[PDB]
Every structure is written in structure tokens, then in C-alpha cells.
Design a protein around this ligand. Structure first.
Ligand code: CDL
Ligand code: CDL
Ligand code: CDL
Ligand code: PC1
Ligand code: PC1
Ligand code: PC1
Ligand code: UQ8
Ligand code: PEE
Ligand code: PEE
Ligand code: SF4
Ligand code: F3S
Ligand code: K
Lengths: 87, 82, 117, 172, 106, 69, 164, 158
């Protein structure tokens, strides 16, 4: 077909992108911000220097025997503790 | 393709061929039938939804305001935040 | 953009009232006019619904003082409130220190309609 | 290239028969309720009234605006198009014509008139510098303000008056 | 026709209904009722819902005011702490969290 | 801080009008509200045929044939 | 009809006359007008016939009923023919492909001239059958033939009056 | 530094007070299956896996311990959430098939214009119906909060 940069099809697409993308990104960002606001209040990430010391403290406070608790490292900076005897 | 060449077109209001115009009229009835049925959702939500903090609300009215008349001393800072 | 002219504009009260009245008296003989009868009828039905709501909240006002928070000039403050809550965990790390034990006091009031002691 | 979205008869020669048929539909000839009485000279028309037609009677019917309207690309056989709508308002605006209500009633159709979405590709390409978009907007405003429940009957009565006409597009 | 005949016969009865079999009056009334729903009923419903929301929330909040008045306590945070996330500010929710904390920690 | 009564009718009624007005406006006043009617008229109306194959008819036809109706 | 409503002859005359002009004044060319309105016309037409039954010999209501019935006959007949023309035009459009480029072009109509011959024959039948509704016939079917004439070169009596 | 993820306090109580396994009902199985995956850039929301654990544990109906009562209330809230997920799929399928059959004879442009919107609207109607039939519209704020308490929380030292 005959395609031209100044065509209505291409120019409309550029006009739509310029007009809507700035609005959509702002609108999406605002929603993301609201989600972050609730997330941090419900469960804020907290950093611990040494996992082992924190894990031992956690077991002591909750009265959990470390033997029955499985510790795994999901990521480099993420370590997760799970119940070994869980259905 | 080859469209049929022996179509018996409608001659009057009582000798009618089935055409897409009639089928469109059937669509109109069905889409409007959906609108009647779908109206049940918004009506159902308004009729069934409740907004209560907990089960104590009903107990409070049963014991401290059974007639919806018992006045309560107002202390603005409670619900005003400051 | 739009249908073909079917009736009066919204702000024309006497014109709309005529179509709303015909909704009950003169049956429509076309979709366009029947739709106009509904739209004109919608004006008064919506006005009546809002009218009763305003009347209801005057004849039987809301009793709680919470509704002072719905003032227009307080709306931006309320928006900022939900975006500025303290970060932490929903679970309590340490017991809360209140001068009154509401759950215990509440239990006594329900059981006896009388404050403890 | 030939005019957009037209059936090319040969090379650059387009097929504008539909445009001619649409133009004949609006019946672009002066209509009066009373025939010219004997001894009566030209109908009275002031300069001010004559000035209203200045931007509309100059159309050369080239159809540049007709084929530049996207609404005409999609519904060529139902939408009258910028050129035919401009001429329809020219007769409506004319003071001498006495069938203003009949013309407005006929043109007050969703397909005929309200497919115009204000794109303005019509005014941009007009060789003679006319403003079909402006005239189309005025006609919509006039129709909306002047609509009456009895317009449909008016169209029917005029259709009965055209019962003995020959074949071809017309008021109906 | 055997078993197949029964299968086809049952389907023929099952698929009998069509909109073309409706009476002229009912055919139009269904369209009228559907059009009435979109124009009138739909915009009205949210207004009624808003009315009930206000009335019920007022009932809920006023109950908190009644409780505080009987307790004759000025410790507002004990009844509804506005700094806590979500719905945890309500005194009942605070008690539930307190129970959870006590039963979990040593 | 301890008023005998609290005036709520004014504030509540104002909110009702503002919320009701906005919703009733968006649903009644604008011409943009008839955008879906325009799109259907522009691109969907009268663009139909019964002599062209379509998947929904083919799917129904094959299933009926498969089950011997 | 099953109804308990009662109307005077003056009311019956008004209802029949209103329906007659509503149908005749409507633009039949736009398919959506008939789709949306016909359900309303039929419901009214059933009521009009019931109330006007005792006036079928009336010197005023009688002629209105005959014209009303004749107009409804013509409306259905013209709609059916024009509905077939729309199908032929839609088939031709889809045969062009995507963006009219033929990218996903469908199969063309192999018997287009035969269809044109069939449609024009039906068009002539309407003119003879409904001599008092030519303006409406030309609006719907006559204009439809002109659109087809652009796609295919065929001859019909009124072709020259459509600038062909 | 490092982040440590540990079971939440309410999760600990559930493990301590569970008496046996709880059978997963048919609608609960389908509901969990149809629940969308939840990527976890951070941890603040219950996913399908956490809900399964909650529904798997069994508690004593007659126990009067306040802690056990909270566990039962949390489990009921999660159950209503899970079974409500069954309404999404029927709405989506009806949202696509019904309009598609209606517009079968029309051109492709119409199907592109109409089907995407009808599909989303159908799913929305299904989700409303599912949540409505699952008794979610009558839950108190207390019950809803318990059903939404996270199962995993970042550890807070001291
Ligand atoms: C149903 C219509 C409803 C309409 C609306 C209501 C108004 C009507 C009211 C009156 C209804 C009468 C009921 C008629 C029963 C069927 C017999 C009949 O009329 O057959 C005609 C005709 C036989 O002619 P005839 O006039 O009876 O007499 C012939 C001469 O006498 C010459 O005799 P012959 O010796 O040549 O004939 C041989 C004879 C030999 O028959 C006899 O021995 C005579 C007595 C037959 C009695 C049949 C009773 C029904 C049997 C099924 C019982 C199921 C129990 C389930 C229990 C619950 C727990 C499972 O064959 C029959 O009589 C045919 C029996 C057909 C049975 C199948 C019925 C339909 C399907 C449903 C049952 C499926 C069962 C599957 C079993 C699979 C096993 C592996 O049969 C056929 O040709 C077609 C058969 C299929 C009929 C389909 C009916 C429609 C079903 C769908 C309805 C859906 C309604 C819409 C809403 C539904 C919402 C959910
Ligand atoms: C996100 C989820 C939702 C997505 C959409 C879901 C879609 C399914 C909805 C199901 C509900 C019922 C649908 C309509 C039922 C049928 C009505 C009907 O036939 O009436 C005659 C109908 C006109 O009825 P009417 O009620 O007198 O006119 C409505 C006017 O707006 C005059 O209205 P009014 O004066 O009464 O004012 C009230 C107005 C009030 O309207 C509104 O409230 C505004 C809505 C504006 C439209 C928004 C969506 C625009 C989408 C455009 C299409 C997509 C373009 C492509 C984009 C993607 C490209 C990849 O209400 C409406 O516009 C109608 C509401 C119900 C349908 C539209 C629902 C839109 C939902 C939008 C939700 C999001 C809102 C965000 C707002 C953001 C604010 C900043 O005319 C036609 O049927 C014309 C058809 C032309 C083509 C030929 C088709 C064959 C004809 C044979 C019969 C076929 C019947 C079925 C037609 C549809 C086939 C697909
Ligand atoms: C265990 C498994 C097995 C057993 C299962 C259970 C069995 C139970 C049996 C007893 C109960 C039955 C229930 C009723 C079903 C009856 C269906 C029926 O009769 O359909 C009639 C109908 C034909 O009638 P028609 O009027 O002429 O229609 C023509 C076409 O349908 C053309 O139609 P269209 O193109 O116009 O499009 C249609 C579409 C047009 O609309 C659309 O397409 C658009 C749809 C809207 C747009 C948005 C989509 C979103 C959808 C959301 C879905 C819901 C979500 C929420 C719920 C989620 C789940 C919780 O219409 C609709 O969608 C309208 C729906 C209206 C809903 C009304 C609901 C009523 C509620 C009543 C109240 C509740 C109950 C009472 C209690 C009340 C308490 C207060 O048949 C079909 O639809 C079939 C179409 C497919 C054809 C193949 C199948 C049929 C066989 C044809 C064979 C032809 C062979 C020819 C051979 C020729 C050469 C030999
Ligand atoms: C003559 C004009 C006629 C115009 C007709 C216009 C019809 C408009 C229809 C709108 C429907 C809106 C429904 C919203 C959903 C409500 C569901 C619900 O919960 O309802 C029960 C509840 C009952 O309240 P409740 O306090 O018992 O609690 C129910 C439970 N909760 C609290 C959880 C909701 O509320 C209502 O009844 C809602 C109001 C219904 C109003 C419907 C429209 C009234 C139209 C009156 C027309 C007057 C004619 C004037 C001339 C008279 C001449 C004699
Ligand atoms: C011709 C067309 C006429 C135009 C249309 C007219 C229709 C207007 C209908 C309005 C309905 C109002 C519904 C309100 C819903 C919101 C409140 C709610 O649901 O609360 C439950 C409420 C009760 O809840 P409550 O919270 O108010 O109760 C508090 C009261 N105590 C403390 C005692 C409990 O009940 C109602 O909704 C009652 C609604 C009554 C509405 C009456 C409307 C009359 C309209 C007259 C119009 C006359 C037209 C004449 C036309 C003549 C033509 C020639
Ligand atoms: C005859 C004269 C009649 C005059 C009528 C005048 C009508 C117009 C008046 C406007 C009324 C507005 C009422 C809004 C509702 C009340 C506020 C509310 O609920 O917020 C408090 C609520 C209360 O929250 P809260 O629960 O935190 O409140 C407690 C407050 N503390 C914590 C301090 C104790 O705030 C929130 O929930 C936060 C979000 C607020 C969202 C606000 C929505 C605004 C809507 C804007 C619509 C604009 C449409 C037009 C846009 C055009 C753009 C070009
Ligand atoms: C049919 O003609 C038309 C009309 O009738 C005249 C209209 O009215 C209208 C107006 C109608 C409207 C405005 C209604 C709304 C229309 C919309 C939204 C557009 C509808 C049309 C479409 C979506 C176009 C249909 C889809 C397509 C053409 C597909 C687009 C994508 C394409 C072409 C990419 C495909 C490319 C390939 C397959 C190449 C693959 C490449 C490789 C394999 C290379 C590999 C290389 C290596 C190194 C391995 C239009 C648009 C029209 O096109
Ligand atoms: C170039 C500049 C770009 C800028 C981009 C960014 C712009 C940002 C603009 C500001 C956005 C601010 C958003 C704030 C959202 C806050 C929402 C909020 O607080 O909601 C919850 C809050 C209470 O909840 P919580 O305190 O969390 O506790 C749970 C309940 N006790 O809600 C409320 O108090 C009610 C809010 C007012 C509602 C008013 C409308 C009425 C709603 C009900 C209608 C009736 C029922 C439905 C009927 C439907 C029938 C079909
Ligand atoms: C046309 C195509 C249809 C395709 C199938 C669609 C099926 C849709 C089913 C899934 C969606 C439903 C909503 C999601 C579930 C909501 C949660 C839920 O489970 O709701 C129930 C309540 O909701 C319901 O019960 C919803 C029921 C929906 C179906 C209603 C129709 C029932 C009759 C069916 C007749 C079938 C006839 C078959 C004929 C066979 C012939 C061979 C909650 O109550 P519970 O506390 O779990 O316990 C209740 C009882 N103690
Ligand atoms: S381009 Fe100008 S002169 Fe030519 S037909 Fe259009 S309005 Fe008339
Ligand atoms: S370009 Fe077309 S949409 Fe109207 S403004 Fe001109 S006739
Ligand atoms: K004039």
C-alpha cells in the first residue's frame, strides 16, 4: 500500500501516544503509589544484619523448636523460614 | 461463492421472507432481555450489602439504644482525629 | 456525533414534563420517541430520588459526628491522611497501653447495662 | 491519484454518480406555497438576508470535501457528506424559501446529518475556501432548537405530494 | 428410529423456543422494559446505594459514640485509633490483634 | 468539644448533591456519552452477510453433525 | 386482540392517522430505523386494527386503514429487497481484503450479474405492485441499485435517472 | 543488608491450634485453581498458596479459646474469598461467546471493537456474582480484616 509519514493513520497514532501515554503513566503510577502506601503500613520491609542471629531470636520469642523449622534462601537478600511439618 | 439466484422476496406484510433485518430485530430483543436480567446485580448489591464494623454494633443498639432515641454525649476529638 | 433530534434539551423543564407525562398517557409508536419519554422521565425520577434523600437527612438527621469529616474543605486533608500513615506491621509488637480496657468494659455493659464497680 | 475511496472508471477519472444522486435528493430548487401572482416582480430580499448566502452559494460541487470526510469513507450511501449538507443549509437559510421546516425535518436523520464528527478535513481541502464544517454545525443547532413532535408527519405529507414524480432520488 | 430417533426428537423439543414465536405485544414490551432499565433504573440505583451507605455507616459510627459515652472515657485512641492501618483502629480489631500477640509470643 | 447537638444535615446534603450531580451528569448530559452508538453506526451497521462463512456457525454446525443432531 | 380498553371513533381515527404518518415519514433507507421502530409499529398496528375494526366501512377511517396497511406492506417488501442488496455490497467489500489491500481478501461473488438481474427484477415488481409508494421505493431500493451499479455494469430502466 | 521472611503471628497460632487436616471442598479446589498468580515484588498480600494452607487446617468447632475463635473466623473469610473466584470464568466465557455468536455474521472490525469490551464486562459481572453469592457483601469489617492478614511478615528484630 501507499504509506506516508504525514498520513492520517501514522499521525493519529503519534498524536494518540503523545496525548495518552503521559496521562496513563501518571494514572497508573498514582494507583501504584496508593498500593505502596497500604503495603508499607501493613508489612514494612525490615533489614537484619545477620540472618542466623535473627532466626535464633525469632525461634526463642515464638517458642518454636529450630529442628522442625526449615530455613531456605529464596534470593541473595531474601531468606524465608517455613514449617517443616505442614500439610 | 455463488449467491442463490431464486430468492422469493417479501411481497407484503403477511408473506414475508426471513432476512437479516428480522434477525437483527431478534438481536434487539435478546440484548434488551439481557439488560433486564443484568439489572438484578446492582439491585442485589444494594439490597444485600451491609456496612458494619463488627457484631458489637447490633449488640450496642440492643442494650444501649433500643428505640434509636438515646442521646449520647458528644466528644469531638473521638471521630475528628485531633 | 449523536442521534437525530428527538426532543427538548434537559434544561427545558416544561418541554420535558410533556414527554414524561406522555409516558403514561400516549403510548409511543417509535423507538426514538419512547426513548425520549424515558429520558424526560429520568429527569424527574432522578430529581425525586435526590429530593427525598435531602428531605430524609433533614427530617431524620444522621446522629454521629463522623460526618464532619465529609466537609468539602476537609477532603484534601483526608486524602493526605491515607497516604501518610506510619509505616510498620499491622501486627502488634508490644502491648498497647490504654487507660481503659474497652473490651472488658464493653462485656460488662452488655451483660448488666452497668459499668464495672 | 483519483479522489479517495471512489470507484475509478479509468486512470484518474472517478465515479461520482452517488454524489450527484445525493445532491438531487435535497431538491435544490426554491419552493413557495403560493405561485407567482400576475404582475408580481422579483421576490423581496434585503441585502442583509442576501448576505447570509455568501459563503454557501459559491460551491462548485468538485467533491473534494466529499471524499476527504472519513464519515463519507465508511458510509458513502447513507451519509450525505459535507457538500450536500452545505447546499441543504443554503436553501434552509434562504429567506425566499418557505419550506424551511420541511427541509429541516427531512435532514434531521442520524445517518444523513449526524455522521459528521467535526473532523474538519472538509474545510481544509476546499478549493474555493468555503467552510462546510461551519455550515453543518449551524444546521445542527437550528434543527435542535426548532424540533417539534409533528415533524415526522410533515415529512410524510411531503412524501405524499411527491407520489407522481418520476424515478430518481427525491424528498421522501 | 431406534435410539437415534429419541436423541433427535428430544433435541427438537429442547431447541423449540425462538424469539419469533413471541406475541407482538410481548415482543415490544421486552424492548420497552429493557430500554426503561438502561435509561431510568440504572442511574437511580447508585443514588439509592449511596443513601444506604450513609445510613449504615452512621449507624456504625454512632454506636461507637454511644459506647464511649457510657464508658465516660476521654481516651479516644482506645476506641478508634486513627494511626493504625486498615480497619485495625477499631477497638474490637485492636483486641483481636492483642489476642494474637499474646497467644503467639512468649 | 462537647456540643449538645451536631448539625449534619447541611454537610450530608452537600455531599449527596455533589456525588449525585457528578454521576447524573456523566450519565445524562454529555454528548460523549453516546460515543458507543456512533462507533457501532460508523463501522458495524449494515456490514453483515449470511453467505460468508464464520467460525461460530461452523463450530455449531460441526458439533451438531458430530452428535448426529 | 385481547384487551378491555375502549376507544371512541375520534380516538381511533387519531391513532390510525398518527401511525400512518409515522411509518410513511420515517426514513426506510436507514436499516436501524426499521429495526428499532418495527417492533413499536407492530404493537401499535395490532391495537389500531382492533379499535378500527367497526370502522372499516367508515368514509374517514376506512381510507386511512387501507393506506396504513398498504404502507406496511410496502415497507416490508422494500426492506427485504434492500436487505439482500446490502449483503451483496458487504460481500464485495470483504472481497477487497484488509485495508482494501487484498491482504486477507475473501472469495468474490461469481454470479454478480445474475444477482443484479434478480434484484432489478424485484425492483420492477415493487413499482408495479405499489404505484403510490414510488418515493419510498426509490429511496430504499432504487438508491441501492445505484450503489450496485458502481460495482457492476448492468442495465435497468431507471439507470439514466441515477446518472448512469 | 538482608531481609528475613518468617510466618506471621496469626500463622503461628493456626499451626499451634490445628487438630487435623480439613478436606478441601470441590468449589474450593476450583476456586484456588482459577485464582490468578500473584508475583511478589514485596510481601503484603495473601496468595493462592497461603490460602490453601489456611483451608487445609482443621479447628475444633466447640473450642471457646479466643485465639481459636480468631482462627475459625479467618478461615471462613478465606473460604468465601476462594469460592468467589469460581464466578470469574463463567462470566468471561459468556462475555465472549454470547456477543460473538450475536455478531457472527458481521465484519471483523465489529468483533474487534465489541468483543474485548464485552469480555471484560462479562468477567466483571461474573466477579460481582461470585463475590455476592459467596456472602462477601455481608462480612463485617472485622471478618474482612482477619481474612486479609498476611501469612508472611518481614522479621522485626527486638
Ligand atoms: C416431552 C414433550 C414435552 C412438551 C411440553 C409438555 C406438553 C406435552 C405433555 C404430554 C407429554 C407426553 C410424554 C411423551 C413421552 C415420550 C413418548 C412420545 O411421545 O414419543 C413420541 C414418539 C412415539 O409415538 P407415540 O405417539 O408415543 O405413539 C406411537 C405409537 O403408539 C406406536 O407405538 P410403537 O410401538 O411404534 O412405539 C414404540 C414405543 C416403545 O415405547 C414404549 O414401550 C411405550 C411407552 C413409552 C413411555 C416413555 C416414557 C418416557 C421414558 C423415559 C423415562 C425416564 C425415567 C427417568 C427417571 C428418573 C431417574 C433417572 O416408543 C415410544 O413410545 C417412544 C418412547 C420415547 C422415550 C424417550 C422420551 C424422550 C427422552 C427422555 C427420556 C430419555 C430416556 C433415556 C434412557 C436411556 C437408557 C440407556 O416418539 C418419537 O418418535 C420421539 C421420542 C423422543 C421424544 C422426545 C420428547 C422431548 C424431550 C425433551 C423435552 C424438553 C421440554 C422443554 C423443557 C425441559 C426443561 C428441563
Ligand atoms: C469496562 C466494562 C464495560 C465495557 C463495555 C461492555 C459492553 C456491553 C454492555 C452491555 C449492556 C447493554 C449494551 C447495549 C444494549 C443494546 C441497546 C440497543 O440496541 O439500543 C439501540 C442502540 C442505541 O440505544 P440507546 O440506548 O438509545 O443509545 C445509547 C446512547 O448512548 C444514549 O444513551 P442515554 O441518552 O440513555 O445516556 C445513557 C448512557 C450513558 O453512557 C455512559 O455512561 C457513558 C458510556 C460511554 C461509552 C464508553 C465506552 C466506549 C467504547 C466504544 C467502543 C470501542 C471502540 C474501539 C476501541 C478498541 C479498539 C481496539 O448510556 C449508554 O451509553 C449505554 C450504557 C450501556 C452500554 C454502554 C456501556 C459502556 C460502559 C463503559 C464503562 C466505562 C466507563 C468509563 C468512564 C470514564 C469517565 C472519564 O442503537 C444500536 O443498537 C445501534 C447499533 C448500530 C450497529 C448495528 C448493530 C445491529 C443492530 C441490531 C440490534 C443489535 C442490538 C445490540 C447492539 C450492540 C451490538 C454489539
Ligand atoms: C448438566 C449439564 C447439562 C444440562 C444443563 C442444564 C439444562 C437446563 C434445562 C432447563 C433450563 C434451560 C435454561 C434456558 C436456556 C434456553 C436457551 C434457548 O432457548 O435459546 C434460544 C436461542 C434461540 O432463540 P432466538 O431468540 O431465536 O435467538 C436466535 C439466536 O440466539 C441469535 O441470538 P443473538 O445473536 O441475538 O444473541 C443472543 C444474545 C444477545 O446478547 C449478546 O450476545 C450480548 C450479551 C451481553 C453482552 C455482555 C456479555 C457479558 C455476559 C455476562 C454473563 C453473566 C455473568 C454473571 C454470571 C456468572 C456466573 C455466576 O442474547 C443474550 O445474551 C441474552 C441473554 C438473556 C439472559 C436472561 C436471563 C434470565 C434471568 C431470569 C431470572 C432468574 C431466574 C428466575 C429467578 C428470579 C429470582 C428473582 O438459542 C440459542 O441461543 C442458540 C444459539 C446457537 C445455535 C446452536 C444451538 C441451538 C440449535 C440450533 C440448530 C439449528 C439447526 C438448523 C438446521 C436447518 C436445516 C435442517
Ligand atoms: C410517576 C413516576 C414514576 C417513575 C418511576 C421511576 C422508577 C425508578 C426505579 C429506580 C429503582 C432503584 C432501585 C435501587 C435498589 C434498591 C434496593 C433496596 O434495597 O430496596 C429496598 C430498601 C429498603 O431499605 P431498608 O432500610 O429496609 O434496608 C434494606 C437493606 N439495606 C439497608 C442493606 C439496603 O430501600 C429501598 O426501598 C430503596 C428505594 C427504592 C426506590 C425505587 C424508586 C421509587 C420510585 C417511586 C415513584 C413515585 C411515583 C410518583 C407518583 C405517585 C402517584 C400515586
Ligand atoms: C410524570 C413522571 C413523574 C416524574 C417521576 C417521579 C418519580 C420520583 C420518585 C422518587 C423516589 C425516591 C426514592 C428514594 C430512595 C432513597 C431513599 C431510600 O431508599 O430510603 C428508604 C426510605 C426509608 O429510609 P429512611 O432512611 O429515609 O428512613 C428514615 C425514617 N425513619 C427514621 C422513620 C426510619 O424509604 C424510601 O425510599 C421512601 C421513598 C419515598 C419517595 C416518594 C417519591 C414521590 C415522588 C412524587 C412525584 C410525583 C410525580 C407526578 C407526575 C404527574 C405527571 C402529570
Ligand atoms: C442549592 C445549592 C446546592 C449545592 C450543592 C453542591 C454540590 C457539590 C459539593 C461537593 C461535594 C463533594 C463530596 C465528596 C464526598 C465527601 C468527601 C469524602 O468522602 O472524603 C472524605 C473521606 C473520609 O476519609 P476518612 O475515613 O479518613 O475520614 C476520617 C478523617 N480523619 C482520619 C481525619 C479522622 O476521605 C477519604 O476516604 C479519602 C479519599 C477522598 C476521595 C474524595 C473524592 C472526591 C470526588 C471528586 C469528584 C470530582 C468530579 C468532577 C471532576 C471535574 C474535573 C474537571
Ligand atoms: C477493510 O478496509 C477497511 C474499511 O473498509 C473500507 C474501513 O471502513 C476501516 C475503518 C474501520 C474502523 C476505524 C473500525 C476499527 C478498525 C480497526 C480498530 C482496525 C481494524 C484492522 C486491523 C486491526 C488490521 C487487520 C490486522 C492486520 C492487518 C495485521 C497487522 C499485523 C501485521 C500485518 C504484522 C504481520 C507481519 C508478519 C506476519 C511478517 C512476519 C515476519 C517475519 C516472519 C520475519 C522473520 C525474520 C527473521 C529474521 C526470522 C478500516 C480500518 C479498513 O481497513
Ligand atoms: C499532573 C498531576 C498528576 C497527579 C496524579 C495523582 C493524583 C492523586 C489524586 C488523589 C488521590 C487520592 C486517593 C485516596 C484514596 C483513599 C481511599 C480511602 O480512604 O478509602 C477508604 C475509606 C475508609 O476505609 P479505611 O479507612 O481504609 O477502612 C476501611 C473501612 N473502615 O473510604 C471511606 O471512608 C469512604 C470514601 C467515600 C466514598 C464516597 C462515594 C460513595 C461510595 C458508596 C456508594 C454506594 C454503594 C455502591 C452502589 C452501587 C450500585 C450500582
Ligand atoms: C450457559 C452456560 C453455563 C456454564 C456453567 C456455569 C456455572 C457457573 C458456576 C460457577 C460460578 C458461580 C459463582 C461462584 C461461586 C460463589 C460461591 C459459592 O460457592 O456460593 C455458594 C452459594 O451460591 C450458590 O449456591 C450458587 C449456585 C449457582 C447455581 C444456581 C442454579 C442451581 C440449579 C442448577 C440446575 C442444573 C440442571 C441440570 C440438568 C441436568 C440434566 C441431565 C456459597 O454457599 P456455601 O456457604 O458454600 O454453601 C451454600 C449451601 N450450604
Ligand atoms: S471542495 Fe468546496 S467547492 Fe468543492 S464541493 Fe466541497 S465545498 Fe463545494
Ligand atoms: S470532514 Fe467530515 S466529519 Fe464533518 S466537519 Fe467535515 S463533514
Ligand atoms: K428559509
Amino acid at each position: 500500500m501507499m504509506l506516508r509519514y504525514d498520513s492520517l493513520l501514522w499521525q493519529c497514532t503519534l498524536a494518540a501516544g503523545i496525548w495518552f501515554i503521559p496521562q496513563d503513566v501518571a494514572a497508573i503510577s498514582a494507583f501504584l503509589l496508593y498500593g505502596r502506601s497500604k503495603s508499607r503500613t501493613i508489612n514494612q520491609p525490615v533489614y537484619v544484619d545477620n540472618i542466623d542471629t535473627a532466626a535464633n531470636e525469632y525461634f526463642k520469642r515464638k517458642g518454636l523448636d529450630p529442628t522442625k523449622m526449615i530455613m531456605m534462601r529464596k534470593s541473595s537478600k531474601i531468606t524465608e523460614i517455613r514449617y517443616g511439618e505442614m500439610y | 461463492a455463488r449467491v442463490p439466484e431464486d430468492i422469493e422476496f417479501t411481497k407484503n406484510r403477511y408473506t414475508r421472507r426471513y432476512n437479516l433485518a428480522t434477525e437483527d430485530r431478534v438481536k434487539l430483543l435478546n440484548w434488551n432481555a439481557f439488560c433486564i436480567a443484568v439489572t438484578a446485580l446492582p439491585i442485589a448489591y444494594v439490597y444485600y450489602s451491609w456496612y458494619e464494623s463488627s457484631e458489637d454494633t447490633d449488640m450496642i443498639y440492643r442494650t444501649m439504644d433500643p428505640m434509636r432515641e438515646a442521646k449520647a454525649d458528644y466528644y469531638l476529638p473521638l471521630l475528628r482525629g485531633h | 456525533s449523536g442521534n437525530a433530534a428527538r426532543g427538548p434539551p434537559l434544561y427545558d423543564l416544561p418541554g420535558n414534563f410533556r414527554y414524561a407525562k406522555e409516558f403514561f398517557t400516549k403510548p409511543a409508536i417509535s423507538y426514538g420517541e419512547f426513548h425520549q419519554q424515558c429520558t424526560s422521565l429520568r429527569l424527574f425520577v432522578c430529581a425525586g430520588t435526590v429530593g427525598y434523600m435531602l428531605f430524609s437527612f433533614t427530617m431524620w438527621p444522621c446522629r454521629s459526628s463522623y460526618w464532619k469529616n465529609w466537609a468539602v474543605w476537609k477532603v484534601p486533608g483526608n486524602i493526605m491522611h491515607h497516604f501518610s500513615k506510619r509505616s510498620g506491621s499491622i501486627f502488634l509488637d508490644e502491648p498497647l497501653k490504654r487507660t481503659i480496657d474497652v473490651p472488658k468494659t464493653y462485656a460488662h455493659l452488655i451483660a448488666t447495662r452497668r459499668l464495672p464497680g | 491519484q483519483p479522489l479517495p475511496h471512489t470507484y475509478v472508471l479509468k486512470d484518474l477519472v472517478p465515479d461520482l454518480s452517488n454524489f450527484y444522486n445525493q445532491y438531487k435528493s435535497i431538491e435544490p430548487f426554491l419552493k413557495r406555497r403560493r405561485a407567482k401572482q400576475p404582475g408580481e416582480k422579483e421576490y423581496y430580499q434585503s441585502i442583509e438576508d442576501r448576505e447570509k448566502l455568501d459563503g454557501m452559494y459559491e460551491c462548485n460541487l468538485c467533491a473534494c470535501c466529499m471524499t476527504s470526510c472519513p464519515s463519507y469513507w465508511w458510509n458513502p450511501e447513507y451519509y450525505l457528506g459535507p457538500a450536500v449538507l452545505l447546499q441543504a443549509y443554503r436553501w434552509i437559510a434562504d429567506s425566499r424559501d418557505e419550506f424551511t421546516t420541511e427541509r429541516m425535518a427531512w435532514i434531521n436523520d442520524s445517518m444523513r446529518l449526524y455522521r459528521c464528527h467535526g473532523i474538519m478535513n472538509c474545510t481544509s481541502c476546499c478549493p474555493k475556501g468555503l467552510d462546510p464544517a461551519k455550515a453543518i454545525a449551524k444546521m445542527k443547532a437550528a434543527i435542535a432548537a426548532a424540533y417539534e413532535p409533528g415533524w415526522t408527519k410533515i415529512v410524510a405529507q411531503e412524501s405524499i405530494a411527491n407520489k407522481k414524480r418520476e424515478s430518481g432520488m427525491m424528498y421522501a | 428410529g431406534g435410539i437415534g430417533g429419541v436423541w433427535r426428537g428430544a433435541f427438537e423439543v429442547a431447541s423449540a423456543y425462538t424469539a419469533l414465536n413471541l406475541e407482538r405485544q410481548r415482543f415490544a414490551n421486552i424492548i420497552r422494559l429493557g430500554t426503561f432499565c438502561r435509561v431510568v433504573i440504572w442511574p437511580v440505583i447508585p443514588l439509592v446505594g449511596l443513601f444506604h451507605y450513609i445510613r449504615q455507616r452512621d449507624r456504625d459510627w454512632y454506636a461507637l459514640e454511644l459506647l464511649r459515652s457510657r464508658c465516660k472515657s476521654e481516651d479516644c485512641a482506645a476506641f478508634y485509633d486513627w494511626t493504625m492501618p486498615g480497619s485495625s483502629g477499631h477497638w474490637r480489631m485492636q483486641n483481636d490483634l492483642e489476642i494474637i500477640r499474646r497467644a503467639a509470643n512468649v | 468539644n462537647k456540643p449538645v447537638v451536631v448539625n449534619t444535615s447541611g454537610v450530608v446534603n452537600t455531599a449527596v448533591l455533589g456525588i449525585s450531580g457528578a454521576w447524573l451528569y456523566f450519565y445524562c448530559v454529555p454528548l460523549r456519552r453516546k460515543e458507543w452508538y456512533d462507533i457501532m453506526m460508523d463501522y458495524v451497521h449494515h456490514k453483515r452477510t449470511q453467505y460468508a462463512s464464520n467460525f461460530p456457525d461452523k463450530a455449531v454446525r460441526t458439533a451438531l453433525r458430530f452428535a448426529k443432531v | 386482540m385481547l384487551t378491555v380498553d375502549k376507544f371512541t371513533r375520534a380516538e381511533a381515527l387519531q391513532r390510525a392517522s398518527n401511525l400512518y404518518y409515522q411509518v410513511l415519514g420515517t426514513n426506510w433507507e436507514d436499516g436501524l430505523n426499521l429495526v428499532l421502530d418495527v417492533p413499536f409499529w407492530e404493537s401499535e398496528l395490532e391495537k389500531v386494527d382492533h379499535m378500527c375494526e367497526p370502522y372499516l366501512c367508515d368514509d374517514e377511517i376506512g381510507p386511512i386503514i387501507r393506506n396504513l396497511h398498504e404502507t406496511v406492506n410496502c415497507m416490508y417488501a422494500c426492506e427485504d429487497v434492500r436487505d439482500h442488496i446490502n449483503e451483496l455490497l458487504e460481500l464485495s467489500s470483504r472481497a477487497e481484503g484488509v485495508m482494501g489491500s487484498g491482504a486477507a481478501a475473501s472469495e468474490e461473488v461469481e454470479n454478480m450479474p445474475e444477482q443484479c438481474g434478480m434484484v432489478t427484477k424485484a425492483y420492477e415488481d415493487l413499482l408495479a405492485r405499489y404505484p403510490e409508494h414510488h418515493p419510498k421505493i426509490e429511496q430504499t431500493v432504487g438508491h441501492g441499485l445505484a450503489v450496485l451499479r458502481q460495482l457492476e455494469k448492468f442495465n435497468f430502466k431507471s439507470s439514466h435517472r441515477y446518472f448512469f | 543488608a538482608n531481609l528475613l521472611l518468617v510466618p506471621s503471628d496469626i500463622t503461628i497460632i493456626e499451626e499451634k491450634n490445628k487438630i487435623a487436616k480439613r478436606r478441601i471442598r470441590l468449589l474450593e479446589k476450583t476456586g484456588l485453581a482459577l485464582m490468578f498468580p500473584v508475583f511478589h515484588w514485596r510481601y503484603s498480600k495473601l496468595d493462592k498458596h497461603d490460602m490453601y494452607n489456611i483451608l487445609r487446617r482443621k479447628f475444633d468447632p466447640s473450642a471457646s479459646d479466643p485465639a481459636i475463635d480468631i482462627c475459625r473466623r479467618r478461615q471462613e473469610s478465606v473460604r468465601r474469598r476462594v469460592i468467589a473466584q469460581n464466578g470469574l470464568l463463567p462470566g468471561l466465557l459468556l462475555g465472549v461467546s454470547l456477543p460473538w455468536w450475536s455478531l457472527r455474521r458481521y465484519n471483523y472490525q465489529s468483533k474487534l471493537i465489541v468483543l474485548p469490551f464485552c469480555a471484560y464486562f462479562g468477567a466483571i459481572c461474573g466477579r460481582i456474582a461470585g463475590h455476592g453469592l459467596s456472602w462477601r457483601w455481608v462480612e463485617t469489617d472485622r471478618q474482612r480484616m482477619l481474612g486479609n492478614l498476611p501469612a508472611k511478615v518481614y522479621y522485626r528484630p527486638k
